[PDB]
């Protein structure tokens, strides 16, 4: 056709790729390593691509959080001769801020030419400010835009409102919506969504009934399932049930594209309400919308079923996931691991722990956290020590460090008080020392008295000055300076 001459089916195979780039980069999987390997193999080749092909590739790589390969492809293909326009420069600015940080994004914006510093680049930098929560520089961009008469779109106002909601100054939203209505700016559905969220955050449930009637009066915005998701979340957190069911049934009517996240929202909202029959009603629709169901829907479903106490249904779902799983997801195991430790059927939890790494799932930290929860409920402390050591050795799955909860630490130390396990208390303190540099809220401030078994340590209040100036209760130093 004359509309689209650069067709991807009829194009030459000697010059161009045999399959589209957004199909080629995802051949070996969606993993970071496989995407990087595919990009490295492609950039060394002698086959070429289209500009719209690279644009859709950038959007697909951005849509799954793959920011480094998207930035690398954009930089290399611009270096090879593909000229960025203003829109492509806005997308590249957002990609730079996503990958190398806002300090790199600011330098890219400065090094941009002057005729490229238009409303698209300004709005992209504003969004990259609000997503990184820098209120002062945000407002410094805002008054500069208002001074230079750059057209402020609804996207910028929604970005500021989401920034206000996340920072905690959520009372500014009702002033700002009337500001953007006074400045002749029509809103979108996300404007009503953040307005509703700020109104519910202001402890005002009765205000969300006058906004829905106003957008019904407007007649210009299309209501979407995200609106009803916000209504369902606000009502379920507020305890109202029938209005939440009406919102969720309207949500089910609005989900015409069979969205996986929307189905997850139905499942978790009906699970938090507690209605098992309609939970299974949406679940059968989910199995009718995707036969090869991913592990995320199982992760939601089995957690909902065990929070609604359907344990043999969860056990049959486990066998279904076993017989149809391609990746042995450890979180699926770890849901019923914590289930079997909470209801105490510990032999089957131990069997799953043994059989997971053979089938191909290595243990993360939360399984050991649930087992030390089990051991701190049943009073065995040595096995809680053996669990917390392996938990801090594994650490977090995103590169963080695992730290035990304050309530569990407090209960474990109260258990240490009775048995006079000074060695156990010292090992727990050493573990917390390795975990964190601070180590103290209630950890040892009133907990010198575990030394009241036989003698005490040497330093006499000088060790307690070492760990960054802690302060103890007034009724704690008396048995300390009695024993000197």
User: How many CA atoms lie less than 13 Å away from 144 in the CB half-sphere?
Assistant: 13
Q: Does 255 bind RNA (CB under 7 A)?
A: no
Please provide the size of the chain in residues: 484
Q: Does 197 bind RNA (CB under 7 A)?
A: yes
Contacts to RNA from residues 115-134, by CB under 7 A: 120, 123-124, 127, 130-131
Closest listed residue to residue 268, CA positions, set 290, 292, 236: 236
CB of 91 to RNA, least distance (A): 5
> Residue 446 corresponds to which tokens in the numbers above?
């009133």
Contacts to RNA from residues 131-150, by CB under 7 A: 131
- Which CB, 253 or 460, lies closer to RNA? 253
Q: Does 156 bind RNA (CB under 7 A)?
A: yes
CB of 460 to RNA, least distance (A): 33
Contacts to RNA from residues 313-352, by CB under 7 A: 313, 316, 322-323, 326-327, 329-331, 334-335
Q: Which of 87, 107, 178, 241 binds RNA (CB under 7 A)?
A: 87
The whole-angstrom separation of Cα 377 and Cα 379 is 6
- Interaction mask 7-36, RNA, x per CB under 7 A: xx--xx-xxx--x---x--xx-xxxxx--x
- Which CB, 297 or 413, lies closer to RNA? 297
The whole-angstrom separation of Cα 329 and Cα 76 is 35
Q: Does 220 bind RNA (CB under 7 A)?
A: no
Closest listed residue to residue 264, CA positions, set 219, 308, 218, 233: 233
Q: Where are the alpha helices (DSSP H) in 259-345?
A: 260-273, 276-289, 295-307, 311-324, 330-342
Q: Does 189 bind RNA (CB under 7 A)?
A: yes
- Which CB, 146 or 258, lies closer to RNA? 258
CA 398 to chain centroid:
11
CB 16 within 8 A of CB 47: yes
The whole-angstrom separation of Cα 124 and Cα 88 is 11
CB of 204 to RNA, least distance (A): 15
Closest listed residue to residue 160, CA positions, set 146, 147, 141, 144: 141
CB of 110 to RNA, least distance (A): 18
DSSP helix/strand/coil, 48: strand
CB of 267 to RNA, least distance (A): 8
Q: Does 462 bind RNA (CB under 7 A)?
A: no
Contacts to RNA from residues 44-73, by CB under 7 A: 44, 46-52, 55-56, 59, 62-64, 72
What are all long-range contacts of 362-366, with beta carbons under 8 Å and residues at least 24 apart? 362/330, 363/330, 363/390, 363/394, 364/330, 364/331, 364/334, 364/394, 364/397, 365/391, 365/392, 365/394, 365/395, 365/396, 365/397, 365/402, 366/331, 366/334
Q: How many of the chain's residues bind RNA (CB under 7 A)?
A: 124
Contacts to RNA from residues 354-393, by CB under 7 A: 355, 357-360, 362, 364-366
Q: Does 80 bind RNA (CB under 7 A)?
A: yes
- Which CB, 272 or 377, lies closer to RNA? 272
Single out the segment in contact with RNA by CB under 7 A; choices: 186-194, 215-223, 340-348, 436-444: 186-194
The whole-angstrom separation of Cα 98 and Cα 174 is 30
Q: Which of 116, 135, 285, 408 binds RNA (CB under 7 A)?
A: 285
Contacts to RNA from residues 391-430, by CB under 7 A: 396-398, 400
Q: Does 268 bind RNA (CB under 7 A)?
A: yes
CB of 275 to RNA, least distance (A): 14
The whole-angstrom separation of Cα 51 and Cα 6 is 10
Contacts to RNA from residues 428-447, by CB under 7 A: none
Q: Does 100 bind RNA (CB under 7 A)?
A: no
């Amino acid at each position: 056709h004359l509309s689209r001459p650069r067709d991807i089916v009829k194009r030459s195979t000697k010059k161009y790729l045999d399959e589209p780039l957004y199909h080629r980069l995802f051949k070996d999987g969606g993993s970071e390593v496989s995407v990087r390997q595919q990009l490295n193999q492609f950039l060394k080749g002698t086959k070429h691509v289209f500009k719209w092909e690279v644009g859709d590739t950038i959007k697909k790589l951005r849509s799954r959080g793959l920011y480094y390969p998207a930035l690398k492809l954009s930089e290399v293909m611009e270096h090879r001769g593909m000229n960025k326009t203003v829109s492509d420069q806005a997308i590249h600015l957002d990609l730079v801020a996503k990958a190398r940080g806002i300090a790199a994004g600011e330098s890219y914006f400065v090094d941009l030419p002057e005729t490229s510093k238009t409303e698209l680049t300004y709005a992209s930098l504003l969004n990259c400010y609000c997503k990184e929560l820098m209120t002062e520089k945000a407002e410094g961009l805002l008054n500069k835009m208002k001074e230079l008469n750059i057209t402020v779109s609804s996207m910028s106002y929604n970005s500021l409102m989401t920034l206000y909601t996340k920072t905690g100054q959520a009372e500014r939203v009702p002033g700002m919506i009337q500001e953007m209505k006074a400045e002749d700016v029509m809103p979108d559905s996300y404007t009503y969504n953040v307005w509703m969220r700020a109104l519910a955050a202001t402890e005002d449930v009765s205000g969300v009934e006058r906004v829905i009637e106003e957008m019904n009066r407007d007649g210009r915005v299309a209501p979407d399932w995200t609106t009803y998701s916000n209504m369902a979340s606000i009502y379920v957190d507020a305890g109202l049930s029938e209005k939440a069911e009406k919102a969720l049934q309207e949500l089910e009517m609005k989900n015409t594209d069979r969205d996986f996240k929307a189905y997850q929202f139905l499942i978790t909202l009906y699970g938090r309400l507690g209605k098992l029959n309609e939970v299974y009603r949406i679940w059968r629709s989910l199995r009718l919308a995707m036969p090869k169901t991913s592990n995320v829907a199982y992760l939601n479903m089995i957690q909902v079923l065990v929070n609604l106490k359907d344990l043999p249904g969860a056990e049959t779902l486990f066998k279904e996931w076993q017989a149809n799983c391609s990746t042995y997801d450890i979180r699926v195991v770890n849901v019923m691991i914590g289930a079997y430790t909470r209801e105490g059927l510990v032999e089957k939890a131990n069997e799953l722990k043994e059989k997971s790494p053979r089938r191909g799932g290595k243990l993360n930290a939360k399984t050991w956290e649930l087992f030390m929860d089990y051991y701190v409920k049943r009073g065995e402390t040595a096995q809680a020590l053996e669990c917390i050591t392996k938990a801090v050795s594994i650490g977090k799955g995103d590169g963080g460090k695992w730290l035990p909860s304050e309530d569990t630490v407090r209960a474990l130390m109260s258990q240490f008080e009775e048995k006079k396990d000074v060695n156990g208390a010292e090992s727990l303190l050493e573990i917390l020392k390795k975990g964190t540099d601070d180590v103290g809220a209630e950890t040892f401030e009133s907990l010198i008295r575990t030394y009241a078994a036989a003698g005490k340590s040497h330093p006499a209040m000088r060790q307690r000055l070492k760990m960054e100036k802690v302060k103890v209760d007034k009724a704690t130093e008396k048995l300390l300076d009695e024993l000197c």
